[PDB]
Design a protein around this ligand. Structure first.
Ligand SMILES: Nc1ncnc2c1ncn2[C@@H]1O[C@H](COP(=O)(O)OP(=O)(O)O)[C@@H](O)[C@H]1O
Ligand SMILES: Nc1ncnc2c1ncn2[C@@H]1O[C@H](COP(=O)(O)OP(=O)(O)O)[C@@H](O)[C@H]1O
Ligand SMILES: Nc1ncnc2c1ncn2[C@@H]1O[C@H](COP(=O)(O)OP(=O)(O)O)[C@@H](O)[C@H]1O
Ligand SMILES: C[S@](=O)(CC[C@H](N)C(=O)O)=NP(=O)(O)O
Ligand SMILES: C[S@](=O)(CC[C@H](N)C(=O)O)=NP(=O)(O)O
Ligand SMILES: [Mg+2]
Ligand SMILES: [Mg+2]
Ligand SMILES: [Mg+2]
Ligand SMILES: [Mg+2]
Ligand SMILES: [Mg+2]
Ligand SMILES: [Mg+2]
Ligand SMILES: [Mg+2]
Ligand SMILES: [Mg+2]
Lengths: 443, 443, 222
């Protein structure tokens, strides 16, 4: 426990918080919230504020709508951009049913359950360092998004060429004021693409932070006349946005992945973990890459994974192990995209890597190659498996896997699959302008 | 035995033909032609006219490009709209290699070969009655088609609501004069959609007609400032276009499909044949629906097939048996669309049919309802299989069927998969406007 | 030389530098950089800040793309146009492989090698006086360049005729605050053409100045 009720009651006074936001995440990963006058703090810290659960994607149904919000005192944060008109402190909340029991369809609560399985394997921390890339597009005169990138710069470009420098600098100011620990910021490879990085934290706090980050990026971008989007591949022909997940296990306050005296200085535990990620890779892609668009990023040549294999310092596989060692030894899973529900992506990646460990699975030979250029025949000779090629293809692999299905739980899994089936179906029945360009004059 | 070289030399002189068109069809079904003045008739009738087979989709390669054209005398036809400035007669041709052997990749030639397997089983002829629907779009001032449908009429609608009577009327005039037996003409169910029906003929003549038909429709439509298209599904939410294939087998010059003393007055051959179609249905669909857009028509609710079954006088299954009997007893295969290559679609439908008869397979119980309004449960319990849902699924199915693969021949099979694999890959990596409307703001 | 690690640590405080830019040059000569908060200063000074070497023209391949940055302490400079919202200091860096050995395709490092061949022949300095001239074009309402020159002046022309006087005046002021010794400033022969001149220096420092000048020119013209 970071904060206690008394701390929060005193913080609110000595900081002049005028409004409280209670936030939570839906099944698709969208931030949701209600705001209450700070005079309703007691009501909320008593877990008494309610909302209509049948209006949040993948929650309850209309006949049994009432649902409750239980604020987590340790997520208390103030939003700087609200202080001049009416200062706002947020709480992230867990969803409870009317009868006192947790909602089993809350993505955040599910992640906590998978983290308890980790505690029983003897580990005491699951660190996640997320790196969610985004694009910036220009607003029109009506404040609506256009298709014009904010610039035509590239990787590590400097201003004139990079025009996101000021917006990024203003995003970093708000995050730093909010307690984020910023590590780096830069223009990314495609035009109008950007990244800001920040220190890894425990699984739950890191997803909370992915949520707060997407929020602060979209808000500040809008003040500079821009529209930020974490959509995976907004444009054909250039890089998509990734949300790489750097994963590590701690045991006794020490990176259990580092072994001073061992091959590549990776301990056996790290090797079993990688063995887990690898085994369930094709199976958890539906969760880590939940939109139709996601599969347009998973194509070779754009520094995105499209083949299951791991390697050191290699930006073409599904798992790179960066050259860092010691406390920074980590398994980077490069398939996750920023459309993923962070709570559910970690649930499924934790379960995969805990499977490999608890059953001491053997890691495969690393592929130290540019997998993108190695031929069909050659990668099947190495047992290199392709990731699912569409969201429908990914959903089918996901259904087939018991340990991943258990990783979500009945409610999450039933709702997640239904929502994705609807989406895929809409997409598949649409007639796209492409089809008209290709066939309307040819046939 | 319709025309001999002497007939042709005589007609050409009496009709005052001034140019000759030598036409053939490529692997996609696209009509191709070269024109030659009538002084070169002898060169053409000696099979000496050559072309770059390396520049026709699906034929030969650049280092072996020289190919020859052999006019089929019985396809002589004068194009009336060309008589005012310089009268043009056409010939459909067979592709030959420069050594003198037929080309193995020539779609029309391939239909001939499957027809020889029909003769080996003892049938005089295979009759096809095509009805390939089309849409009319308005051209703009640059002569380019727009998305404005020519009218907002519906099925069997009368003029002012039907503004297509003009154009069809002229299409029918050209066709009647080029020797077609026209049977009916009308507005069809969707806005701007039209049908012009014509008498069946023997498979090879029927596929030549379909090619000549699409040619004449597009031409006369352009004279009314309209763009005619046989694209399967030009617009989401309204009917697509089909090219329903009315099939029948004759023997001793009699319809082998009729048996007045049988149940439904459908003979054994019919029943076996229908069993052949149902068996290979999910497998030949890649051929009979060869475009990405084809699969957007193959959705429930539009009088297009969705599910492999058959029924009498029912417009919801894959195979409908129309009410008429006697010389008109026929099996109507409604999955084919007017983007299919007519020769290869006949070749795979005949092959499937003939497998049914050869092994005397047993037809399934006819499903006598609206398959669209059946639940997932009902359909499974009845053994009702789904058609492939994308071009990629259809390709995989097609590959694993030796009898369909062999219906295509080696060259065609190999070149078909290559062209459609490429086509599919372009489509899948494309980022569509839909994806942006859905995700660009949501994420 | 110029600065030690401890000098830098102290400078950073007195100036209230808030962000550090680690910059380097790719094979085409185009400056590249990443920005980190001042709290990461110790990480950068430890040669611990990494980057994707495959995403930079002329560097490493994607199979072995991790690459390290080794800031040259002597190249510490504050960017005046950033103080107002988050004061930035840059470091120019050498490129190192993840094994501790210098990267053989680093253009700045290669220049140091030819300089060692100079030393063993008896010389102690190779000085360069670069005179990189530039044109100025008018941007449009969408901040995109047009082909309209800023003016139609010629060599040594005075204002009304020369309309780049203020631009080059602001440039010269940024450079002077960044420690440049500016020597001359004028309009050059062609329409819309300008020259700013600065004192020569050691070959490496002077190439560092060319990359710095191009940056400050493009920034203030905008
Ligand atoms: N032990 C660890 N466990 C999880 N994540 C870590 C660990 N050490 C570092 N990280 C995180 O990994 C992420 C790497 O981001 P970045 O430095 O952008 O990586 P890259 O080298 O992939 O470009 C950072 O968020 C960093 O804090
Ligand atoms: N024995 C037969 N074999 C094949 N096709 C036939 C036979 N008898 C009639 N047809 C054809 O089937 C097609 C039926 O077209 P249409 O009358 O539009 O049918 P529908 O009842 O589907 O609207 C026509 O081309 C017609 O010439
Ligand atoms: N000994 C030297 N070595 C190298 N460069 C020098 C030396 N002395 C002066 N320079 C430089 O040469 C450049 C001459 O520039 P400028 O005055 O523009 O010459 P020009 O006469 O060609 O116009 C200046 O940058 C100046 O500092
Ligand atoms: C330039 S990259 O290797 C580009 C990655 C890409 N955007 C993707 O994952 O789709 N990212 P990083 O070096 O931060 O790991
Ligand atoms: C009106 S219908 O069932 C409409 C058919 C639809 N165009 C389709 O096959 O996709 N055709 P028809 O009655 O000629 O057989
Ligand atoms: Mg990164
Ligand atoms: Mg990145
Ligand atoms: Mg990364
Ligand atoms: Mg009809
Ligand atoms: Mg019809
Ligand atoms: Mg019909
Ligand atoms: Mg000079
Ligand atoms: Mg000069």
């Amino acid at each position: 426990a970071k904060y206690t009720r008394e701390d929060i009651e005193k913080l609110v006074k000595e900081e002049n918080v005028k409004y409280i936001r209670l936030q939570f995440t839906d099944i698709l990963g969208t931030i949701k919230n209600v705001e209450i006058p700070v005079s309703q703090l007691g009501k909320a810290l008593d877990n008494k504020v309610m909302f209509d659960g049948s209006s949040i994607e993948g929650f309850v149904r209309i006949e049994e709508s009432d649902m409750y919000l239980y604020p987590d005192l340790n997520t208390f944060v103030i939003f700087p951009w609200t202080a001049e008109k009416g200062k706002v402190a947020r709480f992230i909340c867990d969803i409870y049913n009317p009868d006192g029991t947790p909602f089993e369809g809350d993505p955040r609560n599910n992640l906590k359950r998978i983290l308890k399985e980790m505690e029983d394997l003897g580990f005491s921390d699951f660190n996640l360092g997320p790196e969610p890339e985004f694009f910036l597009f220009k607003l029109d005169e009506k404040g609506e998004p256009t298709l014009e990138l904010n610039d035509k710069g590239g990787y590590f470009d400097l201003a004139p060429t990079d025009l996101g420098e000021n917006c990024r600098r203003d995003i970093v100011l708000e995050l730093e004021e909010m307690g984020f620990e910023i590590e780096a910021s830069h223009h990314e490879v495609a035009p109008g693409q950007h990244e800001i990085d920040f220190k890894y934290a425990g699984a739950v706090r890191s997803c909370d932070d992915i949520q707060t980050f997407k929020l602060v990026v979209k808000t500040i971008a809008r003040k500079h006349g821009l529209h930020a989007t974490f959509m995976p591949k907004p444009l054909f022909g250039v890089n998509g946005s990734g949300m790489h997940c750097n994963l590590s296990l701690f045991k006794n306050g020490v990176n259990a992945f580092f072994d001073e005296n061992a091959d590549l200085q990776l301990s056996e535990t790290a090797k079993h973990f990688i063995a887990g990620i690898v085994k369930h890779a094709t199976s958890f892609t539906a969760v880590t890459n939940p939109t139709v668009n996601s599969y347009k990023r998973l194509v070779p040549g754009y520094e995105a994974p499209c083949y299951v294999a791991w390697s050191a310092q290699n930006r073409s596989p599904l798992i790179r192990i960066p050259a860092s060692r010691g406390i920074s030894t980590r398994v980077e899973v490069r398939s996750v995209d920023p459309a993923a529900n962070p709570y559910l992506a970690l649930s499924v990646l934790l379960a995969a890597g805990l499977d490999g460990i608890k059953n001491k699975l053997e890691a495969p030979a690393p592929i130290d190659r540019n997998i993108y250029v190695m031929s069909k025949e050659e990668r099947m000779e190495n047992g290199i498996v392709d990731l699912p090629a569409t969201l429908a293809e990914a959903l089918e692999e996901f259904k087939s896997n018991e340990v991943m299905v258990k990783a979500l739980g009945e409610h999450l899994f039933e709702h997640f699959i239904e929502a994705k089936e609807i989406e895929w179906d809409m997409f598949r029945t649409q007639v796209h302008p492409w089809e008209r360009e290709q066939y309307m004059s040819q046939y």
